[model samples]
Target: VKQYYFARRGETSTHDTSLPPPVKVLSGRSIPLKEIPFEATRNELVQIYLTSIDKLIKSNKLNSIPSQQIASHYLFLRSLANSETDGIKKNQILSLAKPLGTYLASKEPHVWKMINELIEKSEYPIIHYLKNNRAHSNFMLALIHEYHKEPLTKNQSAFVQKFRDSSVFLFPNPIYTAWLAHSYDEDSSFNPMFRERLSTNFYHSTLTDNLLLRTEPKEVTLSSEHHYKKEKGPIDSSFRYQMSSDRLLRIQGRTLLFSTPQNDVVAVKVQKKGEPKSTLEEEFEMADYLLKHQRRLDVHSKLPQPLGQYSVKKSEILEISRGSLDFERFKTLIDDSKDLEVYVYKAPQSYFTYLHDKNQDLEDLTASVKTNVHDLFVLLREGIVFPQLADIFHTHFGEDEREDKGRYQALVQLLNVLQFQLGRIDKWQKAVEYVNLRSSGLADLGDSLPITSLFTSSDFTKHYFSELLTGGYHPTFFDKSSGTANSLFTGKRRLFGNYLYLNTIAEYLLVIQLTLGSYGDKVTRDMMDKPKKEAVWRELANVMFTSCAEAIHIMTGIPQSRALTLLKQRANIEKHFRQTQFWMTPDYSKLDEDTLQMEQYSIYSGEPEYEFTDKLVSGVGLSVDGVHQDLGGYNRESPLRELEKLLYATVTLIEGTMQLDKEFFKQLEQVEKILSGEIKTDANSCFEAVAQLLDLARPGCHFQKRLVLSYYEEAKLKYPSAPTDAYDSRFQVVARTNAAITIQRFWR
Candidate 1:
């Protein structure tokens, strides 16, 4: 007999439910060989799998998102789901949606919640309606039985062994693909009954105890997907049920800080009442998945890792933490009549955890610096990055040695030209402002900017939008894309906003207005409080250079074509800043879940992320379907993005050595001596030197590879490159970029 029917336990008041619902029957029990799992089971295994696909398909059609882009796999899924013909294709295609369900479940917990309800609560329809179905209900039961024990036992059939080996993988599993194509036709090695795979939620061993079949619930352990090592005492074993008062972090009252058995300081996110425990767990899973994916691109910092999730009792939390009113933070959240249960996690760097409410920390950061962040951004838009790059690259070159001194001054020469360009930015800016104030282009103003309406609560902020990007209420905002958008500005400024270059000055001025618009909304009507406004400005600036800036490079790779002209880079960078801004803005009405979307204005060249939707893989033409139309979000923002990474790189370079101050110039001099051969280059020491820049946000491969573009002359001696201005066919940067991360880090 196979452990088949899920005939018990409608609900439980515990968070102990396994990934899927656990088995209910005792271990000694088994369904007899005469068991009719097809009718007796709730959609059994294969049948529930298909109906769930049907459910996902039916539900996604009602998704809320703009129609401009959609998930690439949408048509393919619908193609098969709606297909009445080609039953074999239905078997394979619908099976694909199972993994898509894993994706769907990742974004929406309702997926697992709904699937859990459907599978255990309802009866089996014996659903695999495709051709030649043997109905492997016994195998499904056996798989569940052996999986809990961890492996396909030696006693199991060869088919079972092969199935277990392949089942653990998601899409892009070659064996799965091969099995799909060959199973029913020529491959007798596979059983067609195993064609429909289980979503990760259903694949868990927790299903064993859910039947209430096991006398004790299965022990919780780190998942197979987790690549990081864990302490000797599993979170479940040592952290079983204590709510120690001292473990509270004290910064955010809800957070608990404690050492794992290994003495690793882990932070725990205590759950509030409104959000479900499962939902937060899903959040951890999403963050973990993204953080891991980011590592593939070398984005190792800024984002935090999700350790694991478990539940803590409200009674214990309150009892152990009954010291003060603040300690009783979970007070109202707890109900008196029953023991309150909640899920919690330890993620020290909760990236987006409390983003909006970091007043204390933001204030601290603002107070720490003599120069405010907004001022830096103002300088940044003014092409201050050119000087900063000089400071980073050239400051090190001025040494006692002639070769080192020669390197320093020559690098400064490249920068002197760049530095000279910054002085004229304001002329172009003023020109843009002048054209914006009087020009009549209702087409620009009449059409709403992405989320301009929300900021338009008052006249001042509204006008910022009106006059900045779309043209003012009566005048223009975005300068007219004419031949001489800059012809009137004089000299270098005259070159700006020309047809040849992007009306870049207009973009920078627009950013200034956007900054003011941001400032305008929060104060006592733009609010009279200068301090609050300052904090807002600083925080916004921080994001622009960090996460938003990261998207610039991650979304759009380096400038491939149309060599970014002198001041033209700012035009593209700010454009991406705005496009990235559109993503960071929550279009609340779109869907219950907040979305981030970016679309590049690509022509002969250009790129989007912030997780609008997870793609199939890093493979070409092999995208998987995410839950919403937002997955179609790939079709989503720009040259604005192109400039964004450069500016970000500029700031990151500065930030990495900000603490070192003058010492950093000395530090760079040492590094420069090695690259310039003033001193024999030590590859080991040089790598250690460059790796220091990664202390904060850390360089993703995109930023690391592109670092050469910013500090090209200096890094050339170390990694040797084609002349930046060479502008010829040998400009193949792909192989060049894939060289050595050690080299990339050195330049970065």
Candidate 2:
């Protein structure tokens, strides 16, 4: 007996108290624990197991062992043991049984059966405990098969019944050890007879005791080698908006708002750049060192690699770490990075929260356009337009136009006389029709854009018309890279381009009266005063005629000579309107002598109702009495009567508006009928109507009030109800609103 005991004993004597018991040796080497002081903490134990299993699996000793099975079972045991719960003992029982169950399940059939039988005899209630957790149902079923391959004897059957009835594993912890010991006993544990019956096992029974479940799990140490270096250079002021498949980064001045893949919201600041080595270069070097060194280090080999998804090349920097690193490691890397400062934060409650919290003052004017833009425009007129105009009236005409006369007293009159010109003549009206129709289309497929809220809003119209009239504009409807075509039929292919060109020319015409008025002003003309104003005017006409001729050639297939004559005739008629014989200069009755001496002298009027022809042909202009009558002393052949005959013949010869023939009016009527509600229309038709109304809504439009009233009358007659009249209500409202708004704008 002494010889047998001596032969089984390990090299380290049992009496040596300084050292631990001899560890389980496999083949030529022993499985070693990590060198942490005292009991190995759960994290250290996990690392030890991972490293041991990795080596065993890589070498020939273990054919296969499910590391995932080991990790899940071991982690569960530690987590359960660490937690505070009701029925603490029951949880403790489960926590112990689970790891053993996993170990037995991973064994060979013979080893598994032997271990299961021992567990069954020990009355541990592992079967009952495992059955309650469906996660371990397959393991429990396998153990059941081991004990019940055939009919059980009466005593055995009763034992099985007792095991099934139990709720928790009631057996002592020693019995738990016996079951593991029975299956894992060495080849030399018994004599030759017993040894021949049992096959050798890969794991020693001692491994069960070393599970590290008794210790509390430490927090994972998420560390990285590449620490942030000091910043070297200043970052540029130019920031850009960037987006990838799952991420969005928007720059607000110097700060960058970023959305991370790990569901984090963060802000980044590029304060400087790395000097000797860039931050990205350091990160790559650190990852490379870790990949090579981790294999040699025991704990690090088990811990996760710090290689995250960040790469950089020249001017293009890509820090797509994309939340690959754990929170602590990622935070450290960015905080330490030489050039970048990262601020981590929880994601906002939603996209709207970010928008609301970030940008507050930007007007949300377009949102209402989605539901009903017409109503939106009406609201704008009542709320924004009228109030501003009321203030302006008190500035120029003061109380004169303010007809609530006595109710509002003590209003000072600065300028005694003012003049207002209202509507365009019939010839100018045709030009408006031609341009309107040219911009309107059926909006079919292969169309560059269907007119939506983007192009229909009051803001969009203001911007569009402003750009067009000023000769600085770009198309919104189509891609600029889309090449142009010359043939009118094919030129329509560049629909937005054609629309842009035509409207630019048309808007110049739309504001033509104002432009002509500016040039016609005695003060403006005085700037270029010479003895011969006619000779200068004649030279101006010739230059305009040639420019129009060249423009028509580039824009259309019109005959050059015919288009040239048309432009020349249009110029001549406009000039004749401004001629001293016809044009009525405002009567500037001087101010009171005691009043303040104003250096600036100007005239403004909201009503363009008075006809240029009415003043010229009748030889009746605005009197000091603010009424229309023939001048007191001046009498001459009515130049307008002569000019009117010429204008009539001139328009008759052109056969339509400035450049387009009257045939264009056919489409214009369709549009009018649509707006009039005489024809069925889509949102696109309303969009077209809004665009026209916006053009007419411009402050300087002379005939705005009449057109606005006419449209409003049609609107009220057709629908008379709030929503039903909403469409044309915008048209009518904006025009009148614009006339009032015109006064305020002129002062600015």
Candidate 3:
């Protein structure tokens, strides 16, 4: 007698009620998490968070616009966060919290809070992103407020207007998206950020007040205790120097050089969103670093004075020599980053010509050519080696068939890529192979442990790093995600988030070099006259043989010096033609029939076995750092591993520099003191050793003058009878010869 069912809007007895169908509770009910378990690990929590987001996306409750892309990046981080000490991955995940929160159309505000807390507490790098990269995350502001142990209050009236239209308001590149959405082709291979060009937009405050004050920046600084809350003056045009008024004065990297009406050339490094604070600190930090580290402080007065480091609104500014235009500075901030305090300078003459010429960029390409030419000096120095090299060149390019200039340029372009790749390999070899017996404790751990080992040993890492290895020899320290804590163990190589395209591009470039000589047939023959033609043969020979020399060095892991010698001896060019030769057929196609698909470019394209898999015409196509496991490595270890190790090693180093640990990093100071001769030894002897080791025996105006004076002082003091002329003298002649070489490297 118990049939219990409630009819909402239905026909219980005849005339059906016409109310709308009863609503259904189809969406899953929520379970607000109370507290995370003590046993819940960081990785597990992240995975759980991942499942929730993925489920939300699948249910169509997440924001449709960026949900998929954001999900993609989250997965990328999931793959990347292999190490428990991966602060970078943590920060990136933390960064995603807001986006994940903001974009959730699902009922999950509490979910965001849990993810945010996890991110905040997760492993952080020595120099963390939250501290260095300034922007407005509620978590960021709240954390600072929590640090003060006071109620968070804001006077947006004065401060909020400053970044009213901050470009890339959300952390740069939302979801930390990969490129190629902007790309439809190879023409867009390099983003403006990645390529050698200034960013097109001058991202700045576009507020009504800011727009009103293009001529005069508005002043609204609070005088009360309220001013303490503001970031005050990182600076402005109205304060003293102006913003990049109406038009940008000049922009390079992220720094905008504002040439004021007062003839002030103040360099203001604008804080592009997500760019680490170190970018702003480079020139500021290096100003002192270059002036003092292993440097003669007496000459520092001659150098550009270390200037102020500051921030205004969103910008971090470094004012060099109080905005001087006449400084004639040869200074340039090198690979700015963690662990790098490297001070680099271009030649003063290169600067002089650069400032004056219209084709200033030509000088850059010219310099690149000069560097490749410098390689010629390395092997070509054996006075008679030029003959064998040029003879090889004469036989190939010197006497080859002349085709179109376009074809010639292709080889030339490929030649340059090969040359640079080889050069990069050599330096990388030095960076990796060289051992520091002086390293101690933490340094040794960082040195030997290496970054790749974490990826290798970890159960979680799996194929993420293997995928990362696809970048071939180009080591772009993977800071691809939305975090700035990417100062891992790497030298200067900083390629990140290049999509799948980077390795593919690298493959196109490195592999094409295997066929560089193939384009030798296309180069213009005897383009110069008789004697000049012989000189052309020498250079052409240098380049062509260099391709071979580089190929041998790359393929066999032999030294260029030995390889060049072997190249000359063994039937000349025959030894140079290794695997890339046109004659050899594939093992998969040894008994082939002739086919159309196997053309010159097509064979080099290297298709897979599927398409007709014809045994017709096949040849071995060279592959660099092959698939997943072999990515970015040829013979032994991963470059990423080496890079990761270095980045890890350098973290304590840079911070150590900040604290000035005398005993721990005494080697650095020891180097300076040894050069200074402040302790016990003669400065001349140490300088001579440096000069000898580097083979700095070239003559220059600055060098010779310094040398002559150095010699003069020594002779006057130690050997009165010794000649003090430029020709030669026994007094300090031996020391000065070497001393001259070392100083010549920089002074010119």
Candidate 4:
């Protein structure tokens, strides 16, 4: 008989049933051949087998059979094992053994046990009887059973058999009687290894090891994914109940000291009944504050506990403990009435856990630092730039001040905005300078300027768009370009706007203005108007706006040119600075809105809805389908184009001033040491080269524009025979009448 039915028993209170719900009788006992008529006996066996199958499935107690085929095989084997009449009938036995033997041999772990049982019930010993007549029978079984496995050659096979034979009794059997083990283990001596030798002996043994089934009515282990690991525990096995509905979490008062686990503490904030707490943003701020500013200390008993002073969030009131509060002492005592209010402290979580409120620990950090961090807050509020403001925060907040990152992140976001504005200002300044220089049109002066140098390179031309090289230079910023032919004339003062480069006199004025701005004070328009920088800025604004606008108009296409100019005062970037701010003001409103729209549209493409017809439309707006409405556009500015034009024009102007002609030395500038290379020789050969080239060169209208032209002519005359001055072959005369032109112009 196959033991295959389910039997369950409840506590005494629930066990008193009269009928026991028609308890299922599985085919656990065999039926003899003379038991009953054929139909009656076969029908009874089938019914019994079906009932056992149902129970095995319902109870989930048919061992670890994972597949349906294995389950069906086990059921069929059970039916066969339970039938005495079937085994005796020759056809029935063969019919059962063929499919049953193959299935059991291929899949089940206990397949050998059934095969051995089948041989015992057979007319002759299967493998032993076939050894002479069917010598390959066992080998065929092994080959079929272990197909594709690496084979042991005859030599290896004998050695492997020796090892396999010796390993059979390496360990003593476990000391337990059948049926005395836990309910899950099938046998008392069911050593999984060496099952080939003792499988039949172990089969008759009773179960061991109680199975912990997770079917109906069993409590499930709660999944741990949603909860934070640092907050949870290796839960005490003593308790096994689902968590309560009070999701805010509750801790026994003893958790205040982190009593059980004395390392990291998980402080659960208790919420008031029906009172909403701070949001995730607030929690993030709190987390940052703790990570930066607070430290869990072993000597936390020295903290301060303030009485009855915490905020009421809902109906609940909270308090603070003095022993757990963070505190600091004054570094320098001023007087007998030395100030104490400058120092502030944080409350420890241990003491906070025992209190009713925690809001005092989370006061705003900026105001706190203002009173304590070196009186720098006033300067910050007034827009004074300080290089060491980050250090100031660290000093007052402590090295671990978690509040710093929050403030720093906020500061970074704001600085990004300010830096962008500054860049816009720089773009316009470059535009102004570029326009002025380009209009001058001297070849040498343009070459001398950094802005013009970038444009003269073949590499630059190939990689760059042509429309960007549109600016012209103004001479007012650099005096050498003024009062000469092609010089840019403007009435503005050549102002430098950088704060660091400003003289002591200007710095004092800046400090005063900034201080006043902090205190809600303003300068008169008259005072603001008279500052030399104001005039320079006004002129710069006009030059940039006029030149770039013209450049854009001239280019009339997507690709545009731009430029920048270097100064002798290489470090005096203030003019560039002032121009940057000047330019930013105009562009922000012009381009910001459209740029933002583009960014938003790229990110979010939700379906659009039509108000009148309730129909879906293109984009996220009330428009007709397939209309493809660009209801909003981003305000992105082409600063690179403007910059490219400015640099090109400025350098070109310098080159023009030096050569006194457009081509003679139009793109010369002091480049980086690597690019310009070392001046190898002081030979006068260059002087001769210049003179020879000039004989065939055209004269500029602005010949006496500056010393640059005089210098150029002198060098050209001196270096007449040099390669630089050598005239092209086309310039040589083709006839005797103009033979002088060819005689001097031809290269050696």
Residue 234 in candidate 2 has what lDDT?
33
Evaluate model 3: give its lDDT. 0.27
For TM-score, candidate 1 versus 2, the one ahead is 1
lDDT by residue (tens digit), candidate 4, 199-258: 211111001000000001111111222111124332222321121222212333211122
Among all windows of ten consecutive residues in candidate 4, which has the lowest summed lDDT? 206-215
The order of the candidates by lDDT, greatest first, is 1, 2, 3, 4
- Model 2 clash pairs? 228-336, 228-337, 421-608, 422-608, 422-609
Task: After superposing candidate 4 on the true structure, give the runs of residues whose Cα lies further than 4 Å from its correct spot.
Answer: 1-748
Candidate 3 residues lying further than 4 Å off, grouped into runs, are 1-247, 250-253, 258-267, 286-307, 314-366, 369-563, 566-748
Higher-scoring candidate on lDDT, 1 or 4: 1
Model 3 TM-score is: 0.22
List, residue by residue over 646-672, the lDDT tens digit for candidate 1. 432232222221212223244455556
Q: TM-scores of all models?
A: 0.24, 0.18, 0.22, 0.15
lDDT, candidate 2, 1-748, per-residue tens:
1110001101111111222222323376443221112122223323333333334334533334343333333333332332222456436535554544555567644445654442332222232123222222222223233333455433233222322322111122222222222211121121101111233211111121121111122111112221122242332324333434245454432223467666544443332333232433433333343234333321111111222222223122234433332323333333334334322122231321211121221122112111111211121211111111001111122334332221111111100001111111211211222110111110000111111111122343223222211111112111224321111111111122213222223222222222222233333234344435544343333433433443343333345565555444323434343342123233212322232112111110111111222222222232322433222212122222212222222222221221122222333454477666788755533343433332222122335335545654564455444353324444545566767777888999
Q: What are the runs in model 1 whose C-alpha is more than 4 Å off? A: 1-241, 251-253, 258-264, 287-294, 302-308, 333-337, 343-550, 559-748
Give lDDT for model 4.
0.23
Tell me how candidate 2 scores on lDDT: 0.28
CA RMSD per model (angstroms): 31.2, 45.4, 31.6, 43.0
Q: How far is candidate 2 from the true structure (C-alpha RMSD, Å)?
A: 45.4
